[PDB]
Structure formats: structure tokens, C-alpha cells
């Protein structure tokens, strides 16, 4: 077992699309440029993290194929590739492999440097291959060889017989170049070094002299913390959904739910409703949120009135029985209750308000039974002509249709986080990590940043503070009740200074507006982005890779604040010189008279006109599409 | 659980039984089969995974029947306290509701 450098090997066509004379970038599992590739000389099994790059160089027919899977045993499915002098066989079976195969004691069937790439993603096992006569430092792309639809789970693999190279692919962004033939002839790994990042940003393989803003460094979070109120009681949702009888819609029953842990996923067990109907929130995320208070409104209506339980609805139920606000945030759960609320002859216990003087405001209840005066003649509390009882009975019967069958409706109203939360999900809290860039979750408020002890004088009723951008910059811990400032993690723009690829590949990195001691020095790619790593301090920021000199020259590459950079074998930084030193010999009675002259011809270039461009909207926006043209005609 | 067969969904079926990708392109066809898959006393042939260590990736299948370790004490392949069988039976009955 040895280790070696992969150079710019490991490149395949990322699609079946013909492309020519183009610079195309993409994101895929690619073998990194100059990657730590393990060179095995021939026996434990090797892993399959995000794909494999395999290379062979042997003149004899020694390496016969490969074995893939997870445990290489008849409990699971394993994938076997064999080659001989006339045919290649691919097979998928629960083989009982030997620990040093060369194969087994006991589905899918398929019929000079040698490079192969194995990917296992999207239920497909893709094999790319290439043969290149003489790892070489040259560049060559791997054409796709086969695509197996097996969709097998793969975590370990081994070769089948003698030296071979093995590398592991990583999710990378690559900039490939397609020539006139349509063949990938060159590639750039966008995260290899600052020069490659500049090339990717400029979408070119050659960089002119200058300074370019490529990206911004950002310190990644180290931990994930969760802060929830210390609540152990379980919300009594069974008392609402599993009630023996429900109230009428005119007198809908409201249940207060607070100081408990709500597990909405169990609600499906309580009632046989088909699906949720939530507004301003998803039923999927209900377990991840906190609420100040929860209100469960229970009633029974007709099926055709179920659509009336929604924001912005009118009708008898909405106007006079139960009204939801336009900005309602919550869920509506309605299920058929024909077997429980309908009897032979008519169930007349359930009633709804039919007449009222004015429409109800949201979340208003009216249990008055006074006689409604339809006309102008007073009723004097006696029902009769133009004076009807305000409540009408449903009279549910089992023989009625689905639109007339009774439906039990429970409306869950959620109060968003403004006061201390009392209803929370089953999410478990963690410790309150301070002074570190972490991911935090305060009562459902999710963010990333550094939490520090706050000096802000929060009033007792206040729970969080917001900045100019209406984002939470201070928060009160639900358990310790202390105020914490939230500051975004260390970040800053990065500029790359290069003398031009035609001159040298050396580059300098300027972290803009960043103190030189604040430059990240993380040794792990997961703790800082970009993954590449590379000292003078200027008012423009921290410059790394350029040697400051005391001499002064004309500004070549403007860094800023009077600092410029130049290429002199290495990149140097200096203070730009304003001009040559001079001193006029002034005197009370001294003059300078010219005795010669020079006829000087200078050149001044002035632009006069630019290119005249005509644009046709129909072709650009639509391009011979009648439907698109008709839709575009509506834009005026 | 029919609503769980959709992109971006979580829940028992989506997390541990059948997961669709966010960029899923296709169709989902679900129809009631009460007359064919429900029997008096309970049809216990149909099961779903209730416990798993991690959420499934899209288009992944898990047929393992190993005991799930809910707590920190190893189960040693024996079901008991904080160690339950990962598969739970539906027990469909004709008297059940549409949900």
C-alpha cells in the first residue's frame, strides 16, 4: 500500500449531450485534482464513499474484474464484474464471497493505462472507461461505458485478480473545455486553488493581469444546538379528537392547549381523517415548531359546508356560525362522521344559525336564541310571519349523500412566537454553547451564528430583539431566561491578484476588510470555505502571498489604500509612487528661458459610436411559439 | 399516509419506508382497496417500518429486521425494554374509516 498524486486524471463526460467549442461548467462527483490516490500492490475490502476511480497499468491479463456491495455475503445483494478474452459478464446475486477471491462457494444479468470510474447514484451504477497508451501527466477524458439500472446499495468493494490505483470521488464543480471535435481536452477544478477559482469565475482558462473578486470566505458552524422550554406534559389532543359527542357549529367548542408537548404525528391515530388542511404552515413541519398557545375548535357541519371552514369564505356557516380570519395560521381537519352523528329518522341535535343581523367577526361565537326580525314589523319575541327561529336543525340521516352527511371538524389555531412558548414539539434540547459559530434553534427560530452574553436591557415581557433588516439579533433563552446576542460568523470577500497566466501561476490572496489576525487558519475543509488554503496588513485588508518592499514604483495592480502589487520571479506589494521628485529653484530675481524647442506629436483616442443592436421580442422570449406570444401579448 | 407519497414529505412512511426525491418526475396513483386488503379481525400481513437509525435516501429500500436500539443499552438481538421490533403491522379492518 502506497500513496501517489493523481495529477489531472479522473475526468468523465457528465452527460450524454454533444458539446463543441464551449466552456461548460457542472457539479458532480469528480476525482479531485492532485488527489491522494492509494496505489495497491498485490487483502481487506476497500470502501465506496461517493464513487471510485480505478486505474490499471499491467501488461498481462491479471486484473479480471470487481466485486461491489456492503457485506459480500448471502444476506445482501452483491455485484460482480468479470472479463475474459472474448466476453464481459455483469451479475447481481447474493454471493457468498471468499475472503481472498480470485470467487464464491455458492438479480441482474448483463452479457497501456486503463482508467475506470464507478458511480452508484440515482439507482444507477455508471461505469466510465478509457484506454490511453503511455499515472501519466497528460489529459484524457473517460467516455461512459455502461449504465446498470440495478439500484444496488454499495458501501464496500474489492478488485478481482497486479498493482492498481484507487481514488475516491468528491462532490466538485468542474469547468470542462470542449474543442471542435466535441472531446473534453482540458478541465479546471474550481476548488483546487485561488487561480482555479478565478478561472471558474471568469469562465476562461486564461486570466489577464489584475485583481479579481472570486468569492467570500465564511466560517462554518462547529456544532448544532437546540433550545426549547422545559416542558414534560403531553397535550390532551385525544380529549378533542376522540370526544364522544361534538358541539354544534353555532356553539362550537374551544379548548385551550398550553404548557404541554404536542406530537401532531399521533393525530392521525385519533380520527380517520384523510389529510390535513393547513394555512400558513405545513403539517410536515408541525413537530419542529413552537407556539404560544393552541386553540382546538370542535364542531359538526355538513359535507358541502366543509369548504366554508377556510380564510376568506362566506356562506351560512362562515357568516353566522364560524368565521376564520384572512391571516389565519393553523390547520383544519374534517372527517366524515356518518356512522356516529346520523340516525334513522333524522338526528336533530345538531343545529346551525340561519339568520343574523350582521356577519360574525373572526373567532366570534353567538349562542343567542332571540327571534330574528326579517321584516320591519317587530316580532315581540314571538315566531311567525317574517319572524323565524335563528337556529335550523341539520337532520342528518344515513341515507344522505356525502355532501349531506355529517362531518366532524377540528380547527387548530396556532399562535406564533411573540410571548414565551408553551406548546412545543418532541424535539430534545441541548446545551447552550456560547462564543462559537454554531447552528442554533430557539423555540423554532433556526439560524447560524455566534451566541454571546448580551448587555441589552431586555424588559421582562420581551423575548427577542430585531435589527434594521427585521432579523433576530438578540434572543432570550427559554430555560435560563438570559439575553444572548447573535452575530453572524466570520466572513469576508476574497480577491485574487495574478500577473496573468501567460506570465506565471503564482497568485496572491487579499481578504478584504479583514484584520490579518482574523484570517481563518482552519485545518479541515468542513470548518472553512473555500476548501483551498494559502502576510501583510493594508487598510484594504490582509494580503497573503505578496512580499512588501520599501521601494516605490508605478501602480501595476491596484490593491487599494495606496498599496499596489506587481510581478518582479515573485509577487511584491508596495506603496505606489506619485511621481518623480523635483524642486523648482525659485528666487526673487531668477528666470528660466528656453533656448530650444521640440515638436511633439501625441495621440488621443476618443470613442464616437457603439454597435447598433436590434432585438425582436417574439424570437427572443418565445421563438416561434404561438402560446408564448399570446401570453406575452398580455404584458402590454 | 397517502399524502406522504410526495416530494418533500416526512413521516413514518416517508422517513423509513418509501422516500421520493425533491426533483421527482412521475405520477402517484393511490386507490382504496378496503374490499381486497381488509378482513374481519384484522389483516396483519401488511407491515411498515416504525423505527430506524437514519432517514432513508430517495428510492432506498430497507428489509432488515434487526432489533432497533432506542436507548443506550445494547439489545443483543433480543426485543424488550427500549428495544422494539422495527416493523409494525397495520391490522386493516373493514370497520375502519377512510383514513
Amino acid at each position, epitope marked *: 500500500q502506497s500513496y501517489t498524486n493523481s495529477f489531472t486524471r479522473g475526468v468523465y463526460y457528465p452527460d450524454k449531450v454533444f458539446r463543441s467549442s464551449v466552456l461548460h461548467s457542472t457539479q458532480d462527483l469528480f476525482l479531485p485534482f492532485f488527489s491522494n490516490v492509494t496505489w495497491f500492490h498485490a487483502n481487506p475490502v476497500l470502501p465506496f464513499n461517493d464513487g471510485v476511480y480505478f486505474a490499471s497499468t499491467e501488461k498481462s491479463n491479471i486484473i479480471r474484474g470487481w466485486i461491489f456491495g456492503t457485506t459480500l455475503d448471502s444476506k445482501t445483494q452483491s455485484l460482480l464484474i468479470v472479463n475474459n478474452a472474448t466476453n464481459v459478464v455483469i451479475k447481481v446475486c447474493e454471493f457468498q464471497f471468499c475472503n481472498d477471491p480470485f470467487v464464491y462457494s455458492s438479480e441482474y444479468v448483463s452479457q497501456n493505462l486503463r482508467e475506470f470510474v464507478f458511480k452508484n447514484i440515482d439507482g444507477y451504477f455508471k461505469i466510465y472507461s478509457k484506454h490511453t497508451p503511455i499515472l501519466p501527466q497528460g489529459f484524457s477524458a473517460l467516455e461512459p461505458l455502461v449504465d446498470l439500472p440495478i439500484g444496488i446499495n454499495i458501501t464496500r468493494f474489492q478488485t478481482l485478480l497486479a498493482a492498481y490505483y484507487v481514488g475516491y470521488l468528491q462532490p466538485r464543480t468542474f469547468l470542462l473545455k470542449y474543442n471542435e471535435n466535441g472531446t473534453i481536452t482540458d478541465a479546471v477544478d474550481c476548488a483546487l486553488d485561488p487561480l482555479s477559482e478565478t478561472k471558474c469565475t471568469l469562465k476562461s482558462f486564461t486570466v489577464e493581469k489584475g485583481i479579481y473578486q472570486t468569492s467570500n470566505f465564511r466560517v462554518q458552524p462547529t456544532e448544532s444546538i437546540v433550545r426549547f422550554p422545559n416542558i414534560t406534559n403531553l397535550c390532551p389532543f385525544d380529549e378533542v379528537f376522540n370526544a364522544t359527542t361534538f358541539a354544534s357549529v353555532y356553539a362550537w367548542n374551544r379548548k385551550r392547549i398550553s404548557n404541554c408537548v404536542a406530537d401532531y404525528s399521533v393525530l392521525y391515530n385519533f380520527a380517520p381523517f384523510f389529510a390535513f388542511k393547513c394555512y400558513g404552515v405545513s403539517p410536515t413541519k408541525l413537530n419542529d415548531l413552537c407556539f404560544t398557545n393552541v386553540y382546538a375548535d370542535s364542531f359538526v357541519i355538513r359535507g358541502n359546508e366543509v369548504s366554508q371552514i377556510a380564510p376568506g369564505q362566506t356562506g351560512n356557516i362562515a357568516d353566522y356560525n364560524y368565521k376564520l380570519p384572512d391571516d389565519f395560521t393553523g390547520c383544519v381537519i374534517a372527517w366524515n362522521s356518518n356512522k356516529l352523528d346520523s340516525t334513522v329518522g333524522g338526528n336533530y341535535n345538531y343545529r346551525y344559525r340561519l339568520f343574523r343581523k350582521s356577519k360574525l367577526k373572526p373567532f366570534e361565537r353567538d349562542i343567542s336564541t332571540e327571534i330574528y326580525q326579517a321584516g320591519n314589523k317587530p316580532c315581540n319575541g314571538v315566531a311567525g310571519v317574517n319572524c323565524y327561529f335563528p337556529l335550523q336543525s341539520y337532520g342528518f340521516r344515513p341515507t344522505y349523500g356525502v355532501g349531506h352527511q355529517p362531518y366532524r371538524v377540528v380547527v387548530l389555531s396556532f399562535e406564533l412566537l411573540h410571548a414565551p412558548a408553551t406548546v412545543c414539539g418532541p424535539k430534545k434540547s*441541548t446545551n447552550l454553547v456560547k462564543n462559537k459559530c454554531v447552528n442554533f434553534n430557539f423555540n423554532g427560530l433556526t439560524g447560524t451564528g455566534v451566541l454571546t452574553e448580551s448587555n441589552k436591557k431586555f424588559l421582562p415581557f420581551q423575548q427577542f430583539g430585531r435589527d434594521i433588516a427585521d432579523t433576530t439579533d438578540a434572543v432570550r433563552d427559554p430555560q435560563t431566561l438570559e439575553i444572548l446576542d447573535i452575530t453572524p460568523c466570520s466572513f469576508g470577500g476574497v480577491s485574487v491578484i495574478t500577473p496573468g497566466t501567460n506570465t506565471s501561476n503564482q497568485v496572491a490572496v487579499l481578504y478584504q476588510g479583514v484584520n490579518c489576525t482574523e484570517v481563518p487558519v482552519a485545518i479541515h475543509a468542513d470548518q472553512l470555505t473555500p476548501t483551498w488554503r494559502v502576510v501583510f496588513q493594508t487598510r484594504a485588508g490582509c494580503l497573503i502571498g505578496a512580499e512588501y518592499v520599501n521601494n516605490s514604483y508605478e501602480c501595476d495592480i491596484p490593491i487599494g489604500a495606496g498599496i499596489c502589487a506587481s510581478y518582479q520571479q515573485s509577487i511584491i506589494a508596495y506603496t505606489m509612487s506619485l511621481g518623480a521628485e523635483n524642486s523648482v529653484a525659485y528666487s526673487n530675481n531668477s528666470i528660466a528661458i528656453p533656448t530650444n524647442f521640440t515638436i511633439s506629436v501625441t495621440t488621443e483616442i476618443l470613442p464616437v459610436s457603439m454597435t447598433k443592436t436590434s432585438v425582436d421580442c417574439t424570437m427572443y422570449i418565445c421563438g416561434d411559439s404561438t402560446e408564448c406570444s399570446n401570453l406575452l401579448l398580455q404584458y402590454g | 399516509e397517502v399524502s406522504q407519497i410526495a416530494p418533500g414529505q416526512t413521516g413514518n412512511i416517508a422517513d423509513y419506508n418509501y422516500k421520493l426525491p425533491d426533483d421527482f418526475t412521475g405520477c402517484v396513483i393511490a386507490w382504496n382497496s378496503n374490499k381486497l386488503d381488509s378482513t374481519v379481525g384484522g389483516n396483519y400481513n401488511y407491515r411498515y417500518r416504525l423505527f430506524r437509525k437514519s432517514k432513508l435516501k430517495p428510492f432506498e429500500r430497507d428489509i432488515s429486521t434487526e432489533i432497533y436500539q432506542a436507548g443506550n443499552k445494547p439489545c443483543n438481538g433480543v426485543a424488550g425494554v427500549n428495544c422494539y421490533f422495527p416493523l409494525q403491522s397495520y391490522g386493516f379492518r373493514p370497520t375502519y374509516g377512510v383514513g
Partner: antibody
């Protein structure tokens, strides 16, 4: 104020057994994960064991794993360290330590804000 | 996980520096305790710069790169004690204490 009191420390023969008890007051006992930390005279501190608030999880150092056993009684606001097969190196001053609120879980941010008086145990 | 501390440190009265070294210690929360002669340890620093109430403002903390630093400005006669750095190893669930520094 928060108060921690150790007891049970004394003289024990090598290879014997002993039990330390720490009584706690001034805080919600059921919500804090308590610790036992020992120090040999003339040496540095060394964490011994830890128990969670619900007593559903126990943690032991590799140097005392199997020999020691931590337990707690929330109804009595006490927690105990029962050690057996004590070696000669186990002679030390033992402290029962409590974490502050917000770091009371045995997790990344676990640390101690209050320490007990401690008891000397000689093997 | 192993925490490395100097055996001792000396400084003139009235700028003391104590260092706790470990691999990738910048991603770990480091807490500093002070223990006098025959007294229980007292937390002086938490979360690499957090100072509890009642502790003199002389004590300050930092944690970066591969080292955590506890700085005592204008060290008095009563500040001579043993200082310990402590972390919680994520990979093993062990409470790891420092070697110990006396000044």
C-alpha cells in the same frame, strides 16, 4: 444558594468496596447531570463518572470502567458512587460536581460551575 | 483526546499567561478552573471567554488555532494557584481535564 455535601469517604483495604454519597440542595435535582471528579494529592484533576438527570444514562471513565457504578435518588436529591475492587491508585480526594443551567446536559458544552467540599478516600 | 499544559509558569507581580494545547482545540469549548491550596476548584472561564459574576476582571480567555490561552493581567498575590483546562471529548463522551499549571 446551591449546596453540595459529600460523605462516606474514609479508609478502605485494597481490593475492597466503598460508597460515596453527595447530597444536593438549591436547584432542580432531576434536571442536572451530576459528576464525580477525583484528584490525587500532588496531581491534577481527573473526571471519574457522570449521571444524567433522568438516570437513564451513565458514563464512566476508562480508568474506572466496570469498577465503579454511579446512581442517583431524585426523591432524596442525592447521588451515590459505589466503587469496588479499589486499587492503590484510587486514593484521592473526590468531589461531586454540578453543571450550571444551560449546560446541565452531558454534551458538548458540559462544564462545572460549582464544586463540593470533597472527601478524602485512602486505599 | 489529550490536553497539554506547561508544568509551571512564572511572572513578575503586577501579565501571567497559561496555555492549553490540543489538536484542533479551536473547535472545542475550553473551560478554565482555578484551585487554591486545599480548596475546591472554582470556575473562572467558560466557553473560552465567559467570565462568571464575582470573578475579578483580571481573568480573560481566548481559544484559537491549536491553543487556548488564559490571561491574568496585573497578577496579585492571591492569584497564585493551579489552573486547569477542561473540555468534553465528542468522540468518546469523556470529560478531559488539563495537565495543570501552577503559578
Amino acid at each position: 444558594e446551591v449546596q453540595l455535601l459529600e460523605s462516606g469517604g474514609g479508609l478502605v483495604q485494597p481490593g475492597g468496596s466503598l460508597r460515596l454519597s453527595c447530597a444536593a440542595s438549591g436547584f432542580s435535582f432531576s434536571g442536572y447531570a451530576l459528576s464525580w471528579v477525583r484528584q490525587t494529592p500532588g496531581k491534577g484533576l481527573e473526571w471519574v463518572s457522570s449521571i444524567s438527570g433522568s438516570a437513564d444514562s451513565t458514563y464512566y471513565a476508562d480508568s474506572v470502567k466496570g469498577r465503579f457504578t454511579i446512581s442517583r435518588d431524585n426523591s432524596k436529591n442525592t447521588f451515590y458512587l459505589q466503587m469496588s475492587s479499589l486499587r492503590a491508585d484510587d486514593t484521592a480526594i473526590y468531589y461531586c460536581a454540578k453543571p450550571p443551567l444551560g449546560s446541565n446536559l452531558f454534551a458538548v458544552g458540559y462544564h462545572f460551575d460549582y464544586w463540593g467540599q470533597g472527601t478524602l478516600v485512602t486505599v | 483526546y489529550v490536553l497539554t499544559q506547561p508544568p509551571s509558569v512564572s511572572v513578575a507581580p503586577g501579565t501571567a499567561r497559561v496555555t492549553c494545547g490540543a489538536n484542533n482545540i479551536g473547535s472545542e469549548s475550553v473551560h478554565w478552573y482555578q484551585q487554591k491550596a486545599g480548596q475546591a476548584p472554582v470556575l473562572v472561564i467558560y466557553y473560552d471567554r465567559g467570565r462568571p459574576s464575582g470573578i475579578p476582571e483580571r481573568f480573560s480567555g481566548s481559544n484559537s488555532g491549536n491553543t487556548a490561552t488564559l490571561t491574568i493581567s496585573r497578577v496579585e498575590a492571591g492569584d497564585e494557584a493551579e489552573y486547569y483546562c477542561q473540555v468534553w471529548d465528542k468522540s468518546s463522551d469523556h470529560v478531559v481535564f488539563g495537565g495543570g499549571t501552577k503559578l
